Design a binder for this molecule. Sequence first.
Ligand SMILES: Cc1cc2nc3c(=O)[nH]c(=O)nc-3n(C[C@H](O)[C@H](O)[C@H](O)COP(=O)(O)OP(=O)(O)OC[C@H]3O[C@@H](n4cnc5c(N)ncnc54)[C@H](O)[C@@H]3O)c2cc1C
Length: 372
Amino acid sequence: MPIINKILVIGAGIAGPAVCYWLRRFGFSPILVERCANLRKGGHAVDIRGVAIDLAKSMGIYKKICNMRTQVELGRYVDAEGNILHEEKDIEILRGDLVQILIDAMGDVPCHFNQWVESIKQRDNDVEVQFKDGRTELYDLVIGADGLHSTTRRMVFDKDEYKLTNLGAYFSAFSIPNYLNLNHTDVQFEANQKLISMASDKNPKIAITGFCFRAQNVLNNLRDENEQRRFLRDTFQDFGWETSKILELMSDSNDFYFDSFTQVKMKSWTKGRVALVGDAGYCASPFPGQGSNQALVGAYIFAGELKQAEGNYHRAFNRYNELLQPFVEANQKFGVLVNESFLSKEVAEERSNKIMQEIKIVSNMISLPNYE
Ligand SMILES: Cc1cc2nc3c(=O)[nH]c(=O)nc-3n(C[C@H](O)[C@H](O)[C@H](O)COP(=O)(O)OP(=O)(O)OC[C@H]3O[C@@H](n4cnc5c(N)ncnc54)[C@H](O)[C@@H]3O)c2cc1C
């Protein structure tokens, strides 16, 4: 039936650039748009596991990813005065490095920045997208790759067609000058169900920080970056160790990110000519560390099923939904299990090791169909 070619992909994270790669490789014409003025490369290291590694090999990015893998030599745990409590010592790679690798591998896929989708209107034979500058454009399909808080999901699906479950924890990531001269070293301070960390590895001039904490009934409006910064500053006031200096340097950080630990549950990730890929449809929260693997696997399956459906997008979408659902369900379950213990050392480590082993295993329990 009618050929599908022109496809809008909204968001340039992991899922968006990955699905553009596979759509273009399989003979479609994806167009990538991003709301931010440039690529957002902030964020902590991610773990590429299992069949996603085979995808990286097929994508010709495996060697690049191995070359960019994290080299941290020393984990260090300290108390509020900086006394050392303890020291320690699939691919782990900084999120931004993976984003750039995927963008680079994309080839000739137009990538547009500072783009604001206002509305998405499904018509008989296409989807009409209006942008906040008044422009209207037509696409055969539209893909939300826009993350946990997906604008696309909100425009396309009714509120009773998705459920966000906030698990009661929040995290932040941002970069600062490496003022403690950490050398391939990660330092972490934990107290009172809060956590702060700082690590310098890839770049000796820069340290990436992270914050983790639990909160309930948040009064603040956390959709705004300034309110996020404010809530973080207020939560960690008087926390100890290096928190004060880190929060001071945060004012000049250009890669700030803040979010909740939240799972997205939907009976379907697709509606008509619209599909969600990655956190937009299936976020499992950071707890199991599967966000990137889900994005990479979902991208491949989405594009493959579309290729084989030869115009029948509803059939492709149904198979996409069905084939990825078991992996997502497993990941979300493991996320909830991790939640139950997050914020004796031996018991805790033993329980954590079992879950991580099981996460590693299910990452290898996906069949990747042959689309070529
Ligand atoms: C800057 C950044 C930092 C992150 N840091 C961490 C971290 O440290 N730890 C962690 O566990 N997870 C982090 N995440 C989430 C993590 O990347 C995801 O869990 C997953 O790995 C990949 O999901 P995704 O590609 O579907 O969505 P995301 O990586 O969230 O990417 C979404 C992309 O869509 C863009 N976007 C959003 N709305 C619109 C719109 N209306 N129009 C166009 N584009 C839009 C975003 O700006 C972003 O580039 C981060 C996400 C971002 C964007």
